[PDB]
Amino acid sequence: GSLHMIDYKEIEVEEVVGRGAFGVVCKAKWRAKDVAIKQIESESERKAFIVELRQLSRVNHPNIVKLYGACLNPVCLVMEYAEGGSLYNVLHGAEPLPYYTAAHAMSWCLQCSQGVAYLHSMQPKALIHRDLKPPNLLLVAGGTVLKICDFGTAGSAAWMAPEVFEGSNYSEKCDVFSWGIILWEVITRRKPFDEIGGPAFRIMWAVHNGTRPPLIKNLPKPIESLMTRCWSKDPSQRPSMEEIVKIMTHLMRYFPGADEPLQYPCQHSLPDGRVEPYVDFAEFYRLWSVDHG
């Protein structure tokens, strides 16, 4: 990992794009390249700054946002920027919402699993993301490429494995838990545990007591098994990210069309115990029976 020392005085700051898990983030120019700059808000995030910087220096992967360097005066991170938006916004955010397909859904989760598998394989110690959730996953290239962001950690109750907020010892399997919640979220286009709401502790209570998102009607059993094993209480029962990536990869053959940009408009009604999926599985069943006949 080789980061550039960058001189802030050759950075042309533009509009604020949003504020991450920590910090504020702004679009900008630098050497005539569009970039995103992340500045410490109040120096209460100077822990979370030196954290994100130290680990992001090591990492180089297509599905993780590439750090270009940092500045000393003032102290700020400099990341690649591209047109797009958070997975969160795409799923749930400002109308009109874009239409997406099962393929988009499965591709988003495969690409997340790829980026996290990379992190878990880091030597000599695994990087645990530990704040995986749709607000920290960026969609780019017409909503087709997903990039992981926001490593400040090293709002999240809904995605968070029970053992992490139990105060316990936890491992890279905390991520696998989050991954599964997310898989459920892209399939359903619903916010996990939104019906519960309250404040955070009501969700924590619920999950700690074994509550999980509801099962999905008509969901292919192979997807149902992956998802619910990701959600197991016992972290040793959850699959490795490498297993996931292999399973998702093999699954994609029944989900052509990941590479279509999000271009079509959608207005979707939002209806319990077994929810309907937002994406459609009919084509998957068709393709599956074709291969298995």
Ligand X SMILES: CNC(=O)CN(Cc1ccccc1OC(F)F)C(=O)c1c[nH]c(C(=O)N2CCCC2)n1
Binding site per annotation, positions for ATP: 17-25, 38
In the complex with ligand X, which residue's Cβ is closer, 62 or 257?
62
**Which helix or strand (DSSP H or E) is residue 29 part of?**
strand 24-30
Phi-psi region of 257 (alpha: psi -120 to 50; beta: other; left: phi over 0): left
- Written as six digits, the tokens of 268 are 């979707």
Q: State the Cα–Cα distance between residues 41 and 70, nearest whole angstrom.
A: 15
Among 82, 196, 200, 287, binds ligand X (CB under 6 A): 82
Among 26, 37, 71, 79, binds ligand X (CB under 6 A): 79
Among 115, 135, 180, 192, binds ligand X (CB under 6 A): 135
Among 6, 20, 111, 174, binds ligand X (CB under 6 A): 20
Q: State the Cα–Cα distance between residues 113 and 117, nearest whole angstrom.
A: 6
Among positions 35-54, residues that touch ligand X (CB under 6 A) are 36
Q: How far is the CB of 73 from ligand X (least distance, A)?
A: 21
In the complex with ligand X, which residue's Cβ is closer, 83 or 234?
83
- Tell me: does residue 59 bind ligand X (CB under 6 A): no
**Residue 234 appears among annotated catalytic residues:** no
- Give the contacts of 7 (CB within 8 A, at least 6 positions apart): 71
**Residues 179, 63 contacting (CB under 8 angstroms):** no
- Tell me: does residue 84 bind ligand X (CB under 6 A): yes
**Residues 258, 251 contacting (CB under 8 angstroms):** no
Whether a cis peptide bond, with omega within 30° of 0, leads into 277 is: no
Give the 3-state secondary structure of residue 73.
coil
> Which among 83-91, 105-113, 123-131, 167-175 is the span making contact with ligand X, rule CB under 6 A?
83-91
Among 55, 63, 86, 232, binds ligand X (CB under 6 A): 86
Q: State the Cα–Cα distance between residues 21 and 48, nearest whole angstrom.
A: 9
- Tell me: does residue 258 bind ligand X (CB under 6 A): no
- What length is written for the chain? 293
- Tell me: does residue 18 bind ligand X (CB under 6 A): yes
Q: What residues are annotated to the active site?
A: 131
Residues near ligand X (CB under 6 A) are: 17-18, 20, 25, 36, 65, 79, 81-82, 84-86, 89, 135-138, 149-150
